[model samples]
Target: SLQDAEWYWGDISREEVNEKLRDTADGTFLVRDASTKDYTLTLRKGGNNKLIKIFHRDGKYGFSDPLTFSSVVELINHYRNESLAQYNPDVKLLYPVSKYQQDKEDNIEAVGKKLHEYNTQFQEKSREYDRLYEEYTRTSQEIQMKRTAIEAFNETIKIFEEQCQTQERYSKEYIEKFKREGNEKEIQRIMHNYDKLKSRISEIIDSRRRLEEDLKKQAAEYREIDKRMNSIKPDLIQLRKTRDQYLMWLTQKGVRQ
Candidate 1:
């Protein structure tokens, strides 16, 4: 089948095909028929007429015994498709890499390092964001509680003034006087307290916002780096796997194949 296929592809004549067939090296043998001058083929594994009837040089009738026909055909097919396509005795069924191409091992290592750094930055940014959020939450709650306490003190002062003006004579003299002036002074004190609290709250809010913004920028950078790094992962993995397998195969062959 292979020789026939080759003949059909090349338009080989009977004499040429016979010559090539006679040149093969093996224990098997093939001889042409005497009466019809048909090609006689022999192989070590004998079989039926249909199985051994590969092809003939002169005509359609042919018979191959011992089954050397199939093995020879396989070799021919291998040579035609793989080995003979490029006569590079160093490698079989493999294309050579150009000298300009980077080394597989070095490239893989570099790609791995880049991916690791990007992933690390991604994780670090997330942690930093978490830390900033925690601090913001803690400071925000402190500020809210301080503001609530100031509001409660204001309400206490309001009730004292109301008591001094509405039902006064029944109360102690010092109590009445303190109710009048003390409430106003306490309200002033509370206002001053909130000025400091408001400033601190504003600072904390700004700090939190800045940290979050920085974290977002860092995250974007990390994502960009990661996206770029990951783009090469498939090629890098394939190249590494292919390189290892190819080297192992070459070693077994006793030369770089």
Candidate 2:
């Protein structure tokens, strides 16, 4: 399939590569090396949307270097691959010069594969931790919002209490004076004020009850998320330890930095 495509040969700049390969998404593209004029570099996408670049040198396709890209754009920016000697310093000691040690090469590849798997697993666990943390933050915010609502309702109720106190004082004074003078109009006014105060106090009680119920519900949800987060914390710690163990194994194998 790479042979079927129109390959460009020369000192192709980064912009030229983007312009040429812009329409050729999700596939391989061939380009002749400007320096060698004979070798080619092939860009291809592999698993997990990773871009792989292979070198074509010395009349062979898979001899020299193996490079991977996270995106097609990065592959385009890449200029060249390292020679076989650069990729594996012991190339002279392994093959043709003495004996072709395919087993050693296979061992290295196996270690690389295993490391990739471990890294993938570690990332999954990290993502799970982040998801749980986000949920916990939302639950905390909800609880805070409920608390604010309760405070607001309490402030409103306090204002109504002040009004009730003022009305009670006025009613007591008016009833006392009016009873001495036998004034019927003043007695009626005092009763009306008392009724208004009782109704307002009842409304405040109902509003407070509703607010407290909402606050209790939100508090329960907050506690639930807090408990879930506590559970996840231990798992995250274990996952981190496992990931470190894998890294240590790779180090022991002389494959990791």
Candidate 3:
């Protein structure tokens, strides 16, 4: 029973708590004994009411679970000095209705909550933008790596082409030399080497074709991620502007909590 406390409003209903604290200043709150055999902590700010049940579980009393105190008075004292943001950022109880302070009260926290809302939304969007940007970077880097390897393979094929020209010139000379020597073995050696060079060149051409197709697929993938980032850029900029507007307004109010 919190009947002995000055802040307690005994035997009050939901309507009673609202009617009493509705027009009170921000942070004005009171503990009410409800008909349901439970104590409720009600808060009022910007015409919003926060009704938090004083819970009793496993031989402990608190506004929520994992009680920090055994008595309601200790809970009230702790919350008065501390903040209720951990449980719910929307509700804050700073000044009690029993000893309501007029000069010390303002709508600073309420306005801050508004600014915080914009900031939170804007940051999440920015995170989304960053994630997309990173994805684009990763795809672009992979494409560049594959493109470089393909170019290297092209250069290797060009070298093989030069080798083929060199082999053609030597094959004719070998044919004349073999005619002079009149040996079957020398002509057969030249034939085997040419066959090996032609086979290797065909293999390189096949590998190059496969690499080109793979590169085409990766370029398409890169384009999609880039397009997504481009489309989201304007949204991020607009959201940043909206968040900054609230921040500027909050700063101009000079409402420090």
Candidate 4:
């Protein structure tokens, strides 16, 4: 459609524009490339040519912020029936200098097709958001269970060490005292139990470390889905507004099925 938009003069300079609208009525316009970037809407106003720079940001075009159009053609259509008087007093856009004019209903059908396309996009994004939400929530439960397991491991380890601390003597001191008596056979067997627990603690620590790493990876995954869902949030809102506007236009045009 942009290629079909004859009113767009590609990148023609303002100097080469004299012949196009030289004797045309006021409000007649054409879009051409601007000096800095993007396009400029040049309209015949009063006795001089008024050059209004079109700016684009966040994938929408407008003369300025907040008020923007999805495309230059949409912007052109807006001002075609809208007064440019806000920026250029007494100047309301009338027509674009075009090579061909199609039927009114054809344009409506085009919008209807685009509207359907946008609805499909909107629905797809919504479904994706729902999928991510469910996944992250399940991840939340898994993360909770993992932390609980780690805490239990920590608590069990603490109790084992505490049992040693609360004894009549710490393991090595008890063993040394009993060893000097040459009667440590009983204590030697008990030391084996102590030694076994220390080994068990080491194994538990190693396994817990692995679990901690897994937790780190899962948190990162959760954040990734969160970021994606957030990014889709704004697009969903915009798509809804876009499709609704098109549907409203088709309704106003009285276009059926």
Off by over 4 Å in 3: 1-114, 176-182, 254-257
Measured on C-alpha atoms, candidate 1 has an lDDT of 0.42
Q: Which candidate's lDDT is highest?
A: 4
Candidate 1 least-lDDT 10 residues: 43-52
Which residue pairs of candidate 4 clash?
Answer: none
* Tens-digit per-residue lDDT, 1-257, candidate 2: 32232343335444444444444333335454434333334343321122223444443444334434443223333333332244433111111111121123236567677767767877887887798788888878877887887788788888888887888777787788899999998799778877877897798789879879987887887788788878878887767765665665566568444
What do the candidate models score in CA lDDT, each in turn? Answer: 0.42, 0.57, 0.78, 0.79
Residue 184: error of model 4 in Å?
Answer: 4.2
Tens-place lDDT per residue, model 4, 1-257, is 56678788775668767766787889888898786658898989777888888888877989878756999889988877777778535667786776344224367678788888988988998898788889979988998998898898888778877776655356667677778878768786877887877787788788888988998998888888888878988888878777766776688688466
Stretch of 10 with least lDDT, candidate 4: 97-106
Shift of residue 159 alpha carbon in model 1, Å: 26
Model 2: which ten-residue window has the lowest total lDDT?
90-99
lDDT score, candidate 4:
0.79
TM-score of each: 0.30, 0.46, 0.50, 0.53
* Better-scoring candidate (TM-score), 2 or 3: 3
Candidate 3 local Cα displacement, residue 112, angstroms = 4.1
What's model 3's lDDT at 54? 89
